[PDB]
């Protein structure tokens, strides 16, 4: 590519280092999303460098496809396959119906597939929230926005502490652990699972401490029994209130036994015991999974 072959249709989003347009290839008909990255005095943003290099390798049905990079002096365009909306807007549009269980189950299964593929290719996503999960009219859901992602090594080193939009942020990040790993993305997807079922955020804190306490009030304040080493973590305080763990059927009341089992394994405190995306695919919850079209017009 390109550029002269693209016909911009409308602005669809924004945008730290730029803007996203819906556009169409005038010659092939292909509808695309064009992510414009503004250039310059530090040169190409490290977020753009990571998003592009990491997505070059990640070809999977549940990861948004980077089609091309249009690379010039003052502009950088990332050309992506077009997806019709994000999960957040889908949840809002499903306000009164709710999302049918077969769709929630289909979407979780696809997200786990997409994530396991990332992790098998040494990529942490590190910002899984419904806004970064895009859906099409054929029933696909895909991981998007890898600006915050990281290629990791085995075993992991210390990476950026900022990490993950607060509501979806794992307790080991909040407690300042020197290391975090693939488990952080599973924690996020567990929050998303609950959210698809309720259509409201599981842990909507307004600060790190508020976030932690909201988690503790739902899952119990973790001790050495539930999470070996927890009390030695940098930002753990002996003064933390010790909340009792809720009956888990009370966390997401409309969820069936298999659903609650999987959710509980995704929200395990101990990152070492938390379920992996790969193992989760084989969970009894998915025994009857299908891939239906969304019930609403997109």
């Amino acid at each position: 590519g390109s550029m002269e072959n693209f016909q911009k249709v409308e602005k669809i989003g924004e945008g730290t280092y730029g803007v996203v347009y819906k556009a169409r290839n005038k010659l092939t008909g292909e509808v695309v999303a064009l992510k414009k990255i503004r250039l310059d005095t530090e040169g190409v943003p490290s977020t753009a460098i990571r998003e592009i290099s990491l997505l070059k390798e990640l070809n999977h049905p549940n990861i948004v496809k980077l089609l091309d990079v249009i690379h010039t002096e003052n502009k950088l365009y990332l050309v992506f396959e077009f997806l019709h909306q994000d999960l957040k807007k889908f949840m809002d549009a499903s306000a009164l119906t709710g999302i049918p269980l077969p769709l929630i189950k289909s979407y979780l299964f696809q997200l786990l597939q997409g994530l396991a593929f990332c992790h098998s290719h040494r990529v942490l996503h590190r910002d899984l929230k419904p806004q970064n999960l895009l859906i099409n009219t054929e029933g696909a859901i895909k991981l998007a926005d890898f600006g915050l992602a990281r290629a990791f090594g085995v075993p992991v080193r210390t990476y950026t502490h900022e990490v993950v939009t607060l509501w979806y942020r794992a307790p080991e990040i909040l407690l300042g652990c020197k290391y975090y790993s693939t488990a952080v993305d599973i924690w996020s997807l567990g929050c998303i699972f609950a959210e698809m079922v309720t259509r409201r955020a599981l842990f909507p804190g307004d600060s790190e401490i508020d976030q932690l306490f909201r988690i503790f009030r739902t899952l119990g304040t973790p001790d050495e029994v539930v999470w070996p080493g927890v009390t030695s973590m940098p930002d753990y305080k002996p003064s933390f209130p010790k909340w009792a763990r809720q009956d888990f059927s009370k966390v997401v009341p409309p969820l069936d036994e298999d659903g609650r089992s999987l959710l509980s394994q995704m929200l395990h405190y101990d990152p070492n015991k938390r379920i992996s995306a790969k193992a989760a695919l084989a969970h009894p919850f998915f025994q009857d999974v299908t891939k239906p079209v969304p019930h609403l017009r997109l």
Partner: protein, 262 residues
């Protein structure tokens, strides 16, 4: 534990083994460079080691930069006065990919002793990205080493730091190390470090993981052993100085073995 990604380790290793072949520089490129030599490249890589020390960069970042340089020079003829510009843009790109806090671009201009302007560095950054097609997530010696380390019984810091030191020495000398893949240099570096420090050998568990044996590693090991023996005399000395530091357990002060008995 999860930090060692038990559920993905094997997939990752397999993936890296595929990518290293794809990301491999051309073995014979220096022959096709009219104006630059292995020796000039050695000066460059040794300078990059100093830069990484000055700015306290990850060793990973240094490995990446060298991969980017060697790949760039596999297709682009470069005059001697522009070699350091390629090197500097490569280290900038590697830092942005790999560092939590990469040095500012001005910091990169500063360490070139103002040979180049900020505009040149930034234009070279763009050019390197174009030539490499943004394919920056390359496997390094270090990415294999840290996986191999998990097979020690038990873990030994001198073994780890020494293996790293040896892998780092290989970055300096395109002849012969351009011949060998990162996974193979890491394997020879790990065996040689294990042998120097503990008298042990490349373990069976790593034959199982990698399919490499002492016989398949022999050529690289013979090269690396000689490099280790000759290291005090090499014209480039920044890695040796670097590895005297307590940070790396002073491993460059250890004496190489006189024979490998392989």
């Amino acid at each position: 534990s999860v930090n060692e990604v038990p559920d993905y380790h094997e997939d990752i290793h397999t993936y890296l083994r595929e990518m290293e072949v794809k990301c491999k520089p051309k073995v014979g490129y220096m022959k096709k460079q009219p104006d630059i030599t292995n020796s000039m490249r050695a000066i460059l890589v040794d300078w990059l080691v100093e830069v990484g020390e000055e700015y306290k960069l990850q060793n990973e970042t240094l490995h990446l930069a060298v991969n980017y340089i060697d790949r760039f020079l596999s297709s682009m003829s470069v005059l001697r006065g522009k070699l350091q510009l390629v090197g500097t843009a490569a280290m900038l790109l590697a830092s942005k990919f790999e560092e939590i806090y990469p040095p500012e671009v001005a910091e990169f201009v500063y360490i070139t002793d103002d040979t180049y302007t900020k505009k040149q560095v930034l234009r070279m950054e763009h050019l390197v990205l174009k030539v490499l097609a943004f394919d920056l997530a390359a496997p390094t010696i270090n990415q294999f080493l840290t996986q191999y380390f998990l097979h020690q019984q038990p873990a030994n810091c001198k073994v780890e730091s020494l293996a790293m030191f040896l892998g780092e020495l290989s970055l300096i000398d395109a002849d012969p190390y351009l011949k060998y893949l990162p996974s193979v240099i890491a394997a020879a570096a790990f065996h040689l470090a294990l042998y120097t420090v503990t008298g042990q050998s490349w373990p069976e568990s790593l034959v199982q993981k990698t399919g490499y044996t002492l016989e398949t590693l022999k050529p690289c090991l013979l090269d690396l052993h000689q490099t280790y023996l000759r290291a005090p005399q090499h014209a480039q000395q920044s890695i040796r100085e670097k590895y005297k530091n307590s940070k790396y357990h002073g491993v460059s002060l250890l004496n190489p073995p006189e024979t490998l008995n392989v």
